Amino acid sequence: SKDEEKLIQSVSKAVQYMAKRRIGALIVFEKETGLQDYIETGIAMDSNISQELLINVFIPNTPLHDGAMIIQGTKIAAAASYLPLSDSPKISKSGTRHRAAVGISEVSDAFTVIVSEETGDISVTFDGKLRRDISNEIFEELLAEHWFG
Amino acid sequence: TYSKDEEKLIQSVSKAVQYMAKRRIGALIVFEKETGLQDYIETGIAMDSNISQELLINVFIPNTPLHDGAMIIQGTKIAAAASYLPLSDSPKISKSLGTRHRAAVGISEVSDAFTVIVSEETGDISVTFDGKLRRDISNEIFEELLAEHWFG
Numbered sequence: 649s650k651d652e653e654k655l656i657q658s659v660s661k662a663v664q665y666m667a668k669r670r671i672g673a674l675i676v677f678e679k680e681t682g683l684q685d686y687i688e689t690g691i692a693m694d695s696n697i698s699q700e701l702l703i704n705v706f707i708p709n710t711p712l713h714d715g716a717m718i719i720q721g722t723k724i725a726a727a728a729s730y731l732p733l734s735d736s737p738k739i740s741k742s743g744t745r746h747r748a749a750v751g752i753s754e755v756s757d758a759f760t761v762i763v764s765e766e767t768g769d770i771s772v773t774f775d776g777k778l779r780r781d782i783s784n785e786i787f788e789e790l791l792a793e794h795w796f797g
Numbered sequence: 798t799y800s801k802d803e804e805k806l807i808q809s810v811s812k813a814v815q816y817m818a819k820r821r822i823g824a825l826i827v828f829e830k831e832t833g834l835q836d837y838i839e840t841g842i843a844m845d846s847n848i849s850q851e852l853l854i855n856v857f858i859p860n861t862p863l864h865d866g867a868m869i870i871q872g873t874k875i876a877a878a879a880s881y882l883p884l885s886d887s888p889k890i891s892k893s894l895g896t897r898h899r900a901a902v903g904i905s906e907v908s909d910a911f912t913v914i915v916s917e918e919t920g921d922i923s924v925t926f927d928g929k930l931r932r933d934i935s936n937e938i939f940e941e942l943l944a945e946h947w948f949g
């Protein structure tokens with residue numbers, strides 16, 4: 649819908665911004681698995697969403713950059729939350745934010761996007777499986793589909 | 798005298814303003830009284846967020862989109878960031894002063910809002926209300942003024 653696409657653009661434009669600037673980011677989009685347990689380990693925001701706020705949160709050396717940001721519907725549920733970590737061998741040993749995204753994907757049906765601190769690649773995790781280095785067009789397609797759809 | 802959650806907030810704000818004072822990070826926070834600032838809210842970015850010391854710090858970090866302009870609070874929620882306020886033209890304002898000070902004042906003039914400013918250059922905490930700017934208040938005085946202007 650017309651309003652849903654503004655949010656996809658807001659999110660998609662923020663991760664592209666952080667991709668080029670090499671800012672690591674970890675954003676969880678809640679489906680039907682309740683993530684209120686993982687929200688409560690972070691800082692509550694209950695915030696509306698905007699490309700500018702998404703970028704501010706993940707600025708390095710800031711309080712909210714540490715941990716995952718959790719989205720519930722149209723609002724920022726929390727920032728700086730910690731997700732559990734998977735120990736599966738398929739994970740390449742070459743980041744923790746990648747560990748956290750797979751972790752939450754094994755324990756929930758959430759859709760998580762990761763931007764790599766070192767490479768700037770856009771990766772996603774859902775259904776316990778990591779999808780690495782996807783293009784922006786592919787990312788918007790998947791985000792639209794898992795987030796609303 | 799004040800509710801436990803009400804005191805949660807002050808502290809939150811108070812710890813955020815102190816952190817930014819020592820680091821010389823400029824900040825501008827407007828607390829809405831009864832004059833509606835929705836016109837000034839609409840010039841920023843909407844947030845409608847809850848308050849925490851950590852978010853207040855993130856907003857005003859230099860070189861970020863949300864740092865330039867004012868943060869406007871309505872009750873318990875951050876209404877918007879990067880809002881712009883009118884600039885005072887009073888002759889008494891010192892040429893030495895920053896735009897934001899100029900701004901706070903301005904806002905003071907046309908509304909009954911309570912505005913706090915931390916100067917990038919000195920780290921001094923100043924507050925604004927009723928067209929009057931009171932410079933360099935101490936942290937203890939700031940919590941007193943904020944509590945009474947914010948929650949009456």
Ligand SMILES: Nc1ncnc2c1ncn2[C@@H]1O[C@H](COP(=O)(O)CP(=O)(O)OP(=O)(O)O)[C@@H](O)[C@H]1O
Nearest residue numbers: 713714715716729730731732743744745748765766
């Ligand atoms: N429980 C948890 N759940 C989710 N994310 C976490 C987490 N603990 C830490 N993080 C994220 O992990 C990031 C830091 O990871 P680090 O301790 O620097 C190992 P790293 O990610 O491999 O660094 P690198 O990516 O540069 O190699 C933090 O910035 C935080 O965002």
Ligand SMILES: Nc1ncnc2c1ncn2[C@@H]1O[C@H](COP(=O)(O)CP(=O)(O)OP(=O)(O)O)[C@@H](O)[C@H]1O
Nearest residue numbers: 825864865866867880881882883884895896897900
């Ligand atoms: N109308 C307004 N309302 C609120 N804040 C304002 C404002 N106009 C400017 N500011 C604040 O003023 C600060 C910049 O001070 P200025 O006097 O404008 C030097 P500047 O060139 O604008 O700094 P810049 O280097 O960020 O451009 C900005 O952080 C912004 O926060």
Ligand SMILES: [Mn+2]
Nearest residue numbers: 894895896897
């Ligand atoms: Mn200037």
